[PDB]
Write an enzyme that holds these catalytic residues in place. Structure first.
Site, PDB file in Angstrom:
ATOM      1  N   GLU A 176       6.211  16.242 -36.370  1.00 10.61           N
ATOM      2  CA  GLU A 176       5.201  17.232 -35.865  1.00 10.61           C
ATOM      3  C   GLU A 176       5.862  18.637 -35.952  1.00 10.61           C
ATOM      4  O   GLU A 176       6.881  18.880 -35.248  1.00 10.61           O
ATOM      5  CB  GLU A 176       5.057  16.871 -34.360  1.00 10.61           C
ATOM      6  CG  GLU A 176       4.127  17.897 -33.672  1.00 10.61           C
ATOM      7  CD  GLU A 176       3.686  17.539 -32.296  1.00 10.61           C
ATOM      8  OE1 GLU A 176       3.904  16.422 -31.847  1.00 10.61           O
ATOM      9  OE2 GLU A 176       3.095  18.497 -31.812  1.00 10.61           O
ATOM     10  N   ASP A 184       2.566  28.759 -26.890  1.00 12.91           N
ATOM     11  CA  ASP A 184       1.728  27.528 -27.183  1.00 12.91           C
ATOM     12  C   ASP A 184       0.899  27.190 -25.931  1.00 12.91           C
ATOM     13  O   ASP A 184       1.433  26.790 -24.888  1.00 12.91           O
ATOM     14  CB  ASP A 184       2.804  26.486 -27.461  1.00 12.91           C
ATOM     15  CG  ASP A 184       2.263  25.138 -27.761  1.00 12.91           C
ATOM     16  OD1 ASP A 184       1.217  24.945 -28.449  1.00 12.91           O
ATOM     17  OD2 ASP A 184       2.913  24.102 -27.393  1.00 12.91           O
ATOM     18  N   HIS A 198      -0.290  24.589 -33.014  1.00 14.99           N
ATOM     19  CA  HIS A 198       0.984  24.986 -33.693  1.00 14.99           C
ATOM     20  C   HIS A 198       0.810  25.705 -34.987  1.00 14.99           C
ATOM     21  O   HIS A 198       1.456  26.757 -35.277  1.00 14.99           O
ATOM     22  CB  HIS A 198       1.890  23.748 -33.840  1.00 14.99           C
ATOM     23  CG  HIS A 198       2.322  23.183 -32.531  1.00 14.99           C
ATOM     24  ND1 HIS A 198       3.073  22.010 -32.446  1.00 14.99           N
ATOM     25  CD2 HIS A 198       2.109  23.597 -31.217  1.00 14.99           C
ATOM     26  CE1 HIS A 198       3.321  21.725 -31.161  1.00 14.99           C
ATOM     27  NE2 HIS A 198       2.748  22.698 -30.411  1.00 14.99           N
ATOM     28  N   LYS A 201       6.260  22.794 -35.584  1.00 14.50           N
ATOM     29  CA  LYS A 201       5.876  23.863 -34.619  1.00 14.50           C
ATOM     30  C   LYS A 201       6.726  25.080 -35.078  1.00 14.50           C
ATOM     31  O   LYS A 201       7.875  24.829 -35.441  1.00 14.50           O
ATOM     32  CB  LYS A 201       6.234  23.440 -33.189  1.00 14.50           C
ATOM     33  CG  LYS A 201       5.656  24.555 -32.215  1.00 14.50           C
ATOM     34  CD  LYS A 201       6.061  24.162 -30.760  1.00 14.50           C
ATOM     35  CE  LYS A 201       5.384  25.120 -29.768  1.00 14.50           C
ATOM     36  NZ  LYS A 201       5.815  24.737 -28.364  1.00 14.50           N
ATOM     37  N   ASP A 215      -2.699  15.864 -33.618  1.00 17.50           N
ATOM     38  CA  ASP A 215      -2.773  16.300 -32.216  1.00 17.50           C
ATOM     39  C   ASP A 215      -3.862  17.417 -32.073  1.00 17.50           C
ATOM     40  O   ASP A 215      -3.760  18.443 -32.746  1.00 17.50           O
ATOM     41  CB  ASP A 215      -1.463  16.981 -31.773  1.00 17.50           C
ATOM     42  CG  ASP A 215      -0.452  16.010 -31.311  1.00 17.50           C
ATOM     43  OD1 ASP A 215      -0.555  14.779 -31.397  1.00 17.50           O
ATOM     44  OD2 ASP A 215       0.560  16.428 -30.845  1.00 17.50           O
ATOM     45  N   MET A 232       0.962   5.205 -30.289  1.00 20.09           N
ATOM     46  CA  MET A 232       1.995   6.152 -30.763  1.00 20.09           C
ATOM     47  C   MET A 232       2.946   6.272 -29.552  1.00 20.09           C
ATOM     48  O   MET A 232       2.527   6.239 -28.370  1.00 20.09           O
ATOM     49  CB  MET A 232       1.382   7.491 -31.073  1.00 20.09           C
ATOM     50  CG  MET A 232       2.340   8.551 -31.624  1.00 20.09           C
ATOM     51  SD  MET A 232       3.113   9.493 -30.219  1.00 20.09           S
ATOM     52  CE  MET A 232       1.841  10.758 -30.069  1.00 20.09           C
ATOM     53  N   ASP A 252      -3.155  16.586 -27.369  1.00 17.93           N
ATOM     54  CA  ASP A 252      -1.890  17.017 -26.735  1.00 17.93           C
ATOM     55  C   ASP A 252      -2.270  18.359 -26.088  1.00 17.93           C
ATOM     56  O   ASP A 252      -2.334  19.377 -26.795  1.00 17.93           O
ATOM     57  CB  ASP A 252      -0.810  17.106 -27.851  1.00 17.93           C
ATOM     58  CG  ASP A 252       0.475  17.582 -27.151  1.00 17.93           C
ATOM     59  OD1 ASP A 252       0.656  17.688 -25.949  1.00 17.93           O
ATOM     60  OD2 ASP A 252       1.452  17.912 -27.854  1.00 17.93           O
ATOM     61  N   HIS A 310       6.380   9.864 -24.248  1.00 17.96           N
ATOM     62  CA  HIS A 310       7.843   9.952 -24.519  1.00 17.96           C
ATOM     63  C   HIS A 310       8.548   8.909 -23.616  1.00 17.96           C
ATOM     64  O   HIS A 310       8.121   8.585 -22.475  1.00 17.96           O
ATOM     65  CB  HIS A 310       8.428  11.330 -23.979  1.00 17.96           C
ATOM     66  CG  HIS A 310       7.758  12.498 -24.633  1.00 17.96           C
ATOM     67  ND1 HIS A 310       6.551  13.013 -24.179  1.00 17.96           N
ATOM     68  CD2 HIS A 310       8.152  13.286 -25.704  1.00 17.96           C
ATOM     69  CE1 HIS A 310       6.228  14.041 -24.974  1.00 17.96           C
ATOM     70  NE2 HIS A 310       7.129  14.188 -25.916  1.00 17.96           N
ATOM     71  N   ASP A 370      -1.891  25.008 -25.638  1.00 17.73           N
ATOM     72  CA  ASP A 370      -2.302  23.609 -25.426  1.00 17.73           C
ATOM     73  C   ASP A 370      -3.605  23.561 -24.560  1.00 17.73           C
ATOM     74  O   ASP A 370      -3.663  22.783 -23.583  1.00 17.73           O
ATOM     75  CB  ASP A 370      -1.157  22.849 -24.750  1.00 17.73           C
ATOM     76  CG  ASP A 370      -0.009  22.489 -25.634  1.00 17.73           C
ATOM     77  OD1 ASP A 370      -0.112  22.742 -26.859  1.00 17.73           O
ATOM     78  OD2 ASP A 370       0.991  21.938 -25.182  1.00 17.73           O
ATOM     79  N   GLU A 391      -0.428  19.726 -35.255  1.00 17.02           N
ATOM     80  CA  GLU A 391      -1.184  20.020 -33.999  1.00 17.02           C
ATOM     81  C   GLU A 391      -1.940  21.327 -34.216  1.00 17.02           C
ATOM     82  O   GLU A 391      -1.421  22.293 -34.759  1.00 17.02           O
ATOM     83  CB  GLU A 391      -0.139  20.334 -32.878  1.00 17.02           C
ATOM     84  CG  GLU A 391      -0.898  20.585 -31.555  1.00 17.02           C
ATOM     85  CD  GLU A 391       0.028  20.865 -30.430  1.00 17.02           C
ATOM     86  OE1 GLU A 391       0.763  20.021 -30.050  1.00 17.02           O
ATOM     87  OE2 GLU A 391       0.014  21.891 -29.835  1.00 17.02           O
ATOM     88  N   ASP A 434       8.788   9.955 -20.125  1.00 20.38           N
ATOM     89  CA  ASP A 434       7.583  10.074 -19.270  1.00 20.38           C
ATOM     90  C   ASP A 434       7.423   8.696 -18.525  1.00 20.38           C
ATOM     91  O   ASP A 434       6.858   8.669 -17.417  1.00 20.38           O
ATOM     92  CB  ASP A 434       6.352  10.243 -20.154  1.00 20.38           C
ATOM     93  CG  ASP A 434       6.260  11.510 -20.969  1.00 20.38           C
ATOM     94  OD1 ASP A 434       6.811  12.509 -20.455  1.00 20.38           O
ATOM     95  OD2 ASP A 434       5.714  11.499 -22.073  1.00 20.38           O
TER      96      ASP A 434
END
Ligand SMILES: [Mn+2]
Ligand SMILES: [Mn+2]
Ligand SMILES: [Mn+2]
Ligand SMILES: [Mn+2]
Ligand SMILES: [Mn+2]
Ligand SMILES: [Mn+2]
Ligand SMILES: [Mn+2]
Ligand SMILES: [Mn+2]
Lengths: 388, 388, 388, 388
Positions: A181, A255, A220, A183, A245, A88, A287, A54, A257, A217, A57
């Site tokens: 994406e 979630d 998700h 969720k 993902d 990406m 992810d 992102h 992950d 993902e 980040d």
């Protein structure tokens, strides 16, 4: 009997994944922040192909133009030093308090225009760094109560924002496509476009649908109890699997992950079987969040297990489809008949065919077993390496 | 302060709903079978507008042409006697053992051709009786294990069957449209097109998409933990809400099919608010099962409570949207701003607008409360009739 | 590298499991009924140790005393012919319509007395055939709506029925213990004592708690999203794991009863690890349904895969705990410290210990990683047979 | 027709509830921190009876003895100024990184001794402020992977910590009881003692069980899909409902902590019906989070709606049980028969009673309807204020 990744396997990681400091709704960070340059070097040593980011980040929110250029220069140096790519990128439209009611579908119009300008600034950066896919996860688009969001107007606003982004990229002549994406909830009570099917359906109403696909993902779709390999098969059937993902999730709850291969391991097997047999050629992106119980050693062990588990499942699904005894079981279960047209003879011929109705022996057809359990035990034996 | 339905409210019921004998996976029937003629008369006395049917609810499977005509004649007499209509029909492609691996997506090609012929015979009957919508619930299309069904080939077969049905209706010149009803699981481990979004996305790949919409059911989307009013808003936004099935469900578990208003009562409130404010004008159809604890008295009490609860929620949602203090709260929460375009000025104007980025004061925008909880308590007070 | 069961592995099957004809809430039977004598012979050929039964699986409901004795004689002959045992029996208090509101907690008192007499008649038979455990699954004890069942009075009635059964067995001097099997819903909207914890807590209020334990089933706890190995660890910690039902389930949905090893395969691994390391020595009983897609060949293939998957997981969990590199990782993660008393020094010594508070360095303790992800990847490599 | 709380309604709030700054796993705080003194004054103005606290909500972690005394003095002044009480306190054993693997069941023994000393220091404070109940929510006790936690040893450590706390309170002669609050997951993958049943069962193995009960929370049991009023009925039946946490939750997903009455509104109705008809006399405590969309105005509106919704449901459930037509329906459904002993005549009399078996007419009993749907529609009409 080792399973070492190389850059050719196309494994990628978000900066925010190995960089997660471990702050959860109930607890403080357990790890210090990582410099993006360090994560690039560490991931290149483990065999990854590239990283994703992102905006926030890579360049701390509110950075001046001068600090921006400096953060980008250092990052670009680490990519040059390691040969890592950036396939990406995406925008953070969820952390800052301004986004508390959404970015593209916030009720306040001023916030919606800000969300689009923040996005477009990051598309230019993404193009500069070579990304081919730009993801949008609208984690703040939704509601906790029924009167707060008229969903028809919110889908109008979501279509308008994606149409403006497609106008921008076409006007600039960039070679970049978008991937939404889905969720189903968290952090909002309910999130709009909550599954791969809702995102596929929404794309068909955009002005230039060919620019947009999905980035599903694993965890998700499983937060709605859905079969992830079946949703990916539908995205492949539509020609819209632009990116994916990979991670793990234990059923319907927050979630998690977890690293890829944790969670539902048989769904991980059938997902790898499908990606490799359909010839998906995009990034295999993780992810995930190394659990906050871990120190830095545990972070890189977790990221390495993501890639390991993918390559073990790849070998087991390829041994499964190559086994003559499996090929025979697939014919015994009529998978070959599923791939043939039901009525290539056409409608009139079907209506005139007495063997399809008037003289069809329903009891004999009903008595035929499908032999699915023997096929599924072969799949089990192949996954566990217990072929006898 | 009573709430009596009339035929003008457009309430409809499946024959299989009040006719459910109460056989469950663990128990025998607790009620005798009802003659369709009796259910027509009983429902007309309670104020319903019409009934719907699967082929096999009306004409016992395997009936000769002579028995067929007789079952139809008696049924048509009861509709003439009561003024009841038949706005929707559908096919049973799930009960007979021949359908154990599906109808349109069974692996055996012969079964798939039989499923289409059984369907077309019932479309002609449906047209004869005046139905405008023909539903397809593919409850046996799916799998319990990953190797038994290649989902890309199964979606090819599902597209082929729906395309052939659209060819048939256009060739016959019938005025009938199709509505696919999604369900995420049960009786299969996973069912294909498991949610409203997956069904909307699939329709966009058919040869004549304008002939097909969705028939969502309250309890089915809630079996995936999804917000039913948000999925209906997306179906309305796409122009594809052709029909709807109303009932209640307590969360993620087997499909309970409780009477409408049981289950999640606030979601029932927000669904009625949306149907009446978007002006949905199709049938309000109940697909429910009176619990097997009940005798016949309890069956008709359950069916009457379906309609009652709809009319109570209709009155409460209309009082909510009419209250000036609610209209003021909706403005306080910026629902009016959600309905205005984010950038009717166009892309170039947005890029040049310094107030959207360079001079946008993010802290002041972040500090604005959304006032959603006061709005939601007004909605609560209106639902409970506790306006102070 | 084969995995052949023998009677010494203690694998058992219900008559109703391989005998399920495949009737589901939406479909007719796909298989003919099996004679109990045939299932006994077929299971003995596959390597099972024994079978279990409800009263009504063995003697058709309503049989006269003469037919009863005849059904029992034929059954006893097949057990003598094969060496199969009958370690557990139970009562059907769920199929007949009389039980539509429950057996022991039906609102009608007459039904509750009938449920107890039907139960006691079957305890005598069970003792005659050598069973050591008598299971009670109260699948009809519960409600679909809140006013239909006052749960305090219903737990009074449930305690009264179990106390009377414990009086009966002690008065007869039988060596038989009871095991309650929890299930959270289906066929009732909510079932009383819905999880292993609720059943353990309830047992502690019976007059003679030592006569009663639990028979947990893998798929039932997972219908509430719970971790099955953690619930079994609590039942073992309490000394109440009298029997267990093994099968598979894909998350929160209807009760699938898939063969053991399907569903959540990592939970199956950790369950076998725990049963074998705690030395559980009861029957390994499968309560599963071969899917209705299958013919008889597929039934016995499904039952054989139950036992196969158990023995493969047994070998992988024993290789995991035997690996020196795993033993080292368990110490690295402080599993040895979890097994030592926190304060064997006693309360006063803890209060006086400055190293537990006043001088405890919280930052140094917080910085220690737990090394759980490396341990979990070793567990993964062991399950998949990918040790490198 | 207003519904104004007073201190006599016994409504209480955690400092952490109105004090939640809105940090979530994906976003920064949207509100500034509140001084505890301000929340005390604001809640007393809204009609609350008292507040509760974790140690760290009142005295910032790491405060010196001098700052401690000062934070306590200011707090005690605000309670004196307003007449607010503090009926419950608890310990934060979840936020600081040291607790990342648990407090009482952390694998590191040193952390477990620290967790007990931090707890005991707060029990003395709680007693000083007049609390009668001390809650323990072990939100970090559990695991994300199967090898990280041997659950038998972890329950040994959890029993040891609760036994030492019961030794401490008895040695000090304090009049304080403990209440364990279950939660099935979040922030750990699975949390130990995940439901009210598991916590009740565990208490029966402590050295002095009479000192410990449960503090169930509405949203936590619903995170496992369980019926909250049925779990509270079991806790009341056991005599262990020491305290309760009221809030709302929309099904199985992350822990939402919505204001009470949001979420499942019919379960809120049946819970109030049960608390008021069993005469629960403890605090009505709200453990909720005003959504992060809200400013301070929205915080106090949310807290006021908690109390409002309780008093509206109280009035509707009392009108329901007082209605003669409901009393008649309860008899029609045999609720009076559920409250009578099944066999007060004793076992021998039941065995000799031919009317319980040999001459029991099962078909006539099976044909009796339970009339539950008419009863449930009366309950619906009463909740919605639509009595006709
Ligand atoms: Mn995720
Ligand atoms: Mn993602
Ligand atoms: Mn349904
Ligand atoms: Mn339906
Ligand atoms: Mn089961
Ligand atoms: Mn079972
Ligand atoms: Mn909570
Ligand atoms: Mn709580």
């Amino acid at each position: 009997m080792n399973y070492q990744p190389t850059p050719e396997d196309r494994f990628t990681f978000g900066l925010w994944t190995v960089g997660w400091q471990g702050r959860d709704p109930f607890g403080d960070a357990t790890r210090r922040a990582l410099d993006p340059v360090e994560s690039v070097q560490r991931l290149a040593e483990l065999g990854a192909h590239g990283v994703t980011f992102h905006d926030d980040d890579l360049i701390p929110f509110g950075s001046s133009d001068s600090e921006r250029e400096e953060h980008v220069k250092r990052f670009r140096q680490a990519l040059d030093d390691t040969g890592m790519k950036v396939p990406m990128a995406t925008t953070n439209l969820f952390t800052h308090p301004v986004f508390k009611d959404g970015g593209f579908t916030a009720n306040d119009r001023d916030v919606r225009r800000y969300a689009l300008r923040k996005t477009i600034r990051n598309i230019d950066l993404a193009v500069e760094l070579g990304a081919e896919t730009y993801v949008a996860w609208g984690g703040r688009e939704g509601a906790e109560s029924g009167g707060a969001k008229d969903v028809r107007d919110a889908l109008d606003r979501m279509k308008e924002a994606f149409d403006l982004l497609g106008e921008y990229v076409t006007s600039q002549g960039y070679d970049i496509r978008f991937a939404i994406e889905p969720k189903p909830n968290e952090p909002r009570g309910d999130i709009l476009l909550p599954t791969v099917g809702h995102a596929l359906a929404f794309i068909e109403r955009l002005e230039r649908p060919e620019l947009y696909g999905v980035n599903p993902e694993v965890g998700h779709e499983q937060m709605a109890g859905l079969n992830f390999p079946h949703g990916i098969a539908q995205a492949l059937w539509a020609g819209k699997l632009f990116h994916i993902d990979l991670n793990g999730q234990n059923g319907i709850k927050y979630d998690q992950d977890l690293r890829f291969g944790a969670g539902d391991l048989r769904a991980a097997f059938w997902l790898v079987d499908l990606l490799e047999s359909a010839g998906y050629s995009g990034p295999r992106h993780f992810d995930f969040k190394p659990p906050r119980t871990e120190d830095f050693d545990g972070v890189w062990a977790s990221a390495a297990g993501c890639m390991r588990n993918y390559l073990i499942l790849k070998e087991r699904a390829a041994a499964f489809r190559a086994d003559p005894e499996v090929q025979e079981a697939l014919r015994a279960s009529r998978l070959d008949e599923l791939a043939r047209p039901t009525a290539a003879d056409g409608l009139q011929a079907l209506l005139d065919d007495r063997s399809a109705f008037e003289e069809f022996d329903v009891d004999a057809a009903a008595a035929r077993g499908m032999a699915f359990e023997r096929l599924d035990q072969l799949a089990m034996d192949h996954l566990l390496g217990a072929r006898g």
